[PDB]
Symmetry: C3
């Protein structure tokens, strides 16, 4: 194809697909209902990302949004991916540390606003307002990172050290990889246009694989997922 | 801006935003998992309404729908608000009186049809059919009001009198404020066009703040939310 | 109306509506919370299908999708129906055999991809790619049929014989009726265009009523829904 960013969309599609199959093959056999949950959730993440990467690759997940007096290529399928994948990732973390339903409700609701305010920001036709929507989404992200640090973390330690330690690593990964997303949006095609879409697509591809597949490897190789007791 | 209804969209945006912050500040500290749930649910309601009011205010949540041979301004973002907020409000009520999963399923499903049939009605291009969709949505609303009165109410009394009494007030508020919505739609911009959008926007703004913020004040100041036992 | 397929859309609308009322009237009185769940779920199925059939009948749920250098009539409202009804049908089956949350999560997620990949396939503008999306959706369907056969079936027998036997019948019905859907899509208006939309609409109408109403009659007349113990 003629879009310069095809190679990264193709790469991203292959790695999500490859990682979906691996978690599928590893998953079969497992009879533990606790482990059964983590495998379901964590395998669905790249299975979804795979379909959205494919839709971007084939060109379905792309509309042109006019702003700054020019048609801009906006991959809307990213947000449809994130709207479903980011909540499932948070659910993986909350089941580990055995969060109560209240905390889960807030995280998931806040996540919904983050991605939703992101999408509206991405399709807003007044340039200034795009940044208003980014700020609100970013404000929701910080709330989520606050809950991951101060809503549970002390209660995550008052339990199995395999759950506590495995949570500590996955939390640190989540914070570092998720924080990058707003910065890339801000300087990429959707915000200031400082970085061209080509390289922005590379950056999201690296972030998405690490945040989904990299994340899943750490979790599915740990012994926190099993109950044993 | 040049839209006459801006002042009410701006007002509504400020009050939802102001009410979101208040429930947030009041919320922090609370350690009771039952209370934790009611706070999560009831704070998310205006947080969502805030973003949709903002989108209306900035002009994103507005399309023109042609019917009666004229372009009509239709704020579609109301329905995206209600689709999420109205179920969470019903969930607040069902957790109080400890409804079973079956009853919750019906209420939420019925709510989905109500708002969905509402949206389709709002974007239908044949004037007569709009009223067909209104009737079906209104038929779903009555079903919901029947369940609130006769599916639980006797079982809501066979429990803590703080839960029973606090439910009685919130139920009466819900019935009176929710019943108005179909009437306003019917006579406003979306139906008969007897009341102009300007004043219709005022009416929904007053209804929405009372049904969301007013509602939340009553609930969050009560001692039904806490378990204690 | 001038659309040849109106008679089947009208028929389908009447039978869904008629079946919704019947399950409603039969439903009232029932006080058993287990039975309460199955009635909620199984009554919502045709209540939803009714509204989507109506939207198709009135002409709201229809867009023209250009491919093969011609505008093609595509009833998008089928997918909005299935996106909600097919998960609720699977939930009826999983509550019978008392599946764990993990298995339910996978089935529902897989179902989401099936219908989602179906919709994208239905609105893809490159003819070849439509079949790529069909293959992925069909691959998700087979996964679901595998879980219905080999993820539970042995555990469905290790319990009440009324639950085991009633599950056996409903499973066999599900497999036979669901497998037809991809074949009809493939040869109908959305795929190869071997069968005209007129007769395709007939075929989906017969499948939908049997898969929803026929299905519901078998389930709601059984004694598996009640707990008794
Ligand atoms: C699987 C992909 C993941 C984990 C994606 C995460 C994406 C975010 C955390 C995005 C955040 C954004 C903001 C907070 C600012 C507005 C723009 C967004 C949506 C990129
Ligand atoms: C937070 C806002 C609330 C509580 C909104 C409630 C809205 C309704 C109960 C709307 C009902 C409608 C009908 C039953 C008739 C069709 C038009 C609607 C959607 C306004
Ligand atoms: C109430 C209606 C029901 C049970 C509909 C079921 C529909 C399917 C199982 C559709 C399956 C499809 C594929 C697996 C291939 C792609 C096209 C679809 C969506 C028709």
């Amino acid at each position: 194809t003629g879009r310069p960013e095809w190679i990264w969309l193709a790469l991203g599609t292959a790695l999500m697909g490859l990682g979906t199959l691996y978690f599928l093959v590893k998953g079969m056999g497992v009879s533990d209902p606790d482990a059964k949950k983590f495998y379901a959730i964590t395998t669905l993440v790249p299975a979804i990302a795979f379909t959205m990467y494919l839709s971007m690759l084939l060109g379905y997940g792309l509309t042109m949004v006019p702003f700054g007096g020019e048609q801009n290529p906006i991959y809307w399928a990213r947000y449809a991916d994130w709207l479903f994948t980011t909540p499932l990732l948070l659910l993986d973390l909350a089941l580990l540390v055995d969060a109560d339903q209240g905390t889960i409700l807030a995280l998931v609701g806040a996540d919904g606003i983050m991605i939703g305010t992101g999408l509206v920001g991405a399709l807003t036709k007044v340039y200034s307002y795009r940044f208003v929507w980014w700020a609100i989404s970013t404000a929701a992200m910080l709330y989520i990172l606050y809950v991951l640090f101060f809503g549970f973390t002390s209660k995550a330690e008052s339990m199995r050290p395999e759950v506590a330690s495995t949570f500590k690593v996955l939390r640190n990964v989540t914070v570092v990889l998720w924080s990058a997303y707003p910065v890339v949006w801000l300087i990429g095609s959707e915000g200031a246009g400082i970085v061209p879409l080509n390289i922005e697509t590379l950056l999201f591809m690296v972030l998405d694989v690490s945040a989904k597949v990299g994340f899943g490897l750490i979790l599915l190789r740990s012994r926190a997922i099993f109950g044993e007791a």
